[PDB]
Amino acid sequence: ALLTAETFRLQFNNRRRLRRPYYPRKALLCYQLTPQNGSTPTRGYFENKKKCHAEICFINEIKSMGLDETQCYQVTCYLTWSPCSSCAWKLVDFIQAHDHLNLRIFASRLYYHWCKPQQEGLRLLCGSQVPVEVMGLPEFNDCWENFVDHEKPLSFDPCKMLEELDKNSRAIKRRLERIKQS
Amino acid sequence: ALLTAETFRLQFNNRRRLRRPYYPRKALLCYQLTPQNGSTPTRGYFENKKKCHAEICFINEIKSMGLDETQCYQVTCYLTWSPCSSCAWKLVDFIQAHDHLNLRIFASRLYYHWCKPQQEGLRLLCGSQVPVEVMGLPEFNDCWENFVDHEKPLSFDPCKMLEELDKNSRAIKRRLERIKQS
RNA sequence: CUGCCGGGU
RNA sequence: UACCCGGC
Ligand SMILES: [Zn+2]
Ligand SMILES: [Zn+2]
C-alpha cells in the first residue's frame, strides 16, 4: 500500500536538472479524502496506466466510493507533475458536477509550464474552484509522513532530502504565481 | 588533409549545452606556421592520439618539418578544447627551448575551466610568452576558410553557423578573462 | 551530450 | 519535461 521511500525521493524530486543516475520522473498522484463531520481520512495513490492518467484514474475512484452527497469533503491531491490541458478540463468538469467536494491540487513540478495550453489549463483550475499551488515543505512533509513506508533503513537522510524540496520549490512557486497573473 | 564541413561544424561548436542529436565533441587542433620573411604558410590539423594530445603530437612533429633556426616563425593554433594542465606544462617547456618560434593559442571552449589545475595552466601560458585567447569571429572565419573543404553542398548555412559561434564566444571570452585575473 | 550553482520564458 | 541566459 505504501510508497517506498526511494520512490518518494525519486518521483517527487523537483530539482532544476536531474542528477545521475538518470531515471524517468513518472506521473504519480497522492490523494486524501477527509469528511468534515469530524471523521477519519482515506488515502491512496495512482500512476498513469491504460487509457487513464493518474488524475482520471482518481476521478473514477471517487465515483466508486459512492460518497455522501449531503456531506462536504476536503479532497487534497499531491501531483509530481501538474495536470494536462486535457486533464485540466476533465477536472474542472468533475468538480462542477460534485459541488459537495472541495478540491485542492498541489504540484511538485509544473508540467510544460512554458506552453500556453498547460498555462490556460492551470489558470482555469484556479478559476473553477480548483486552487493550484506548488508543494512546499508543509505538503512534502505530509506526503512523506502518510504515504511512504518507513519500516526499512534509508540509504539517505530524509530531513536533508525534504530540505532540498523546500529550497527547490521556491523558484517553482514564483513561476506558478506569474502564470496566474498573465 | 581537409576537415569536412560537418566535422568543423560539430567539433568547433561552442554552445554551452548541445542540441539533439548528441555526439562527443572531441579534441581537435588546426595549426598554421608562417615565417617572418614572407614565405607562404604551412597548415595542418591534429587529433587526440593514445600517447599525446593534439597540442603534443603537434609540437613533437615540428622537428620533422623543413624549418630553420635562423628565421622567426609565428605559430597559431586553433583548439576545440583549451589545453590540459599537463599540456600547458609541456607547451611552455617547448616554447622556452625554441626561441625561433612565437606561439599563440586560441580555444573554442575552455576545458574544465572551473578547476584550479586547468586555470593555473592557462595563467601559466599567458605568463610564459604563450598568449591564450578564446576564438572569435576572426578566428572562426580564419579556420573555416583555410581548413575545411568547400566542394560538397552543405546541409546548413555557414554564415548563420559562424554567427552563432561568434555570439556564443562572448560569454566564454568573459570566463577566460576572469581566469586570467585570479 | 565537459561538471556545478542560479535567473527567466 | 523544452528553450534563453548568468556565474563558478
Ligand atoms: Zn493529463
Ligand atoms: Zn592535454
Side-chain angles (χ1 to χ4, degrees), chain A residues 100-165:
Chain A
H100 69 137
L101 308 186
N102 274 325
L103 190 45
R104 320 173 310 154
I105 285 180
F106 295 87
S108 170
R109 309 179 299 282
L110 307 186
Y111 176 72
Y112 282 96
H113 58 92
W114 55 92
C115 301
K116 295 58 45 174
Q118 284 85 349
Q119 269 156 358
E120 275 151 32
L122 309 176
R123 273 191 303 268
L124 184 71
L125 287 175
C126 300
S128 325
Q129 315 311 318
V130 195
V132 174
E133 297 298 342
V134 180
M135 297 178 85
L137 202 51
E139 293 82 32
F140 287 120
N141 250 348
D142 182 45
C143 194
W144 176 265
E145 276 145 62
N146 322 321
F147 290 86
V148 178
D149 165 40
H150 307 164
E151 65 162 337
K152 318 285 231 267
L154 308 189
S155 304
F156 69 95
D157 193 323
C159 170
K160 284 304 176 209
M161 176 226 61
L162 284 166
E163 221 185 88
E164 169 223 31
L165 301 159

Side-chain angles (χ1 to χ4, degrees), chain B residues 22-36:
Chain B
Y22 300 96
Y23 65 96
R25 287 192 283 190
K26 292 169 220 66
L28 177 65
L29 179 272
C30 295
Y31 69 91
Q32 169 182 311
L33 207 171
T34 84
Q36 304 296 63

Side-chain angles (χ1 to χ4, degrees), chain A residues 35-40 71:
Chain A
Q36 286 328 87
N37 68 78
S39 266
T40 56
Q71 263 266 273

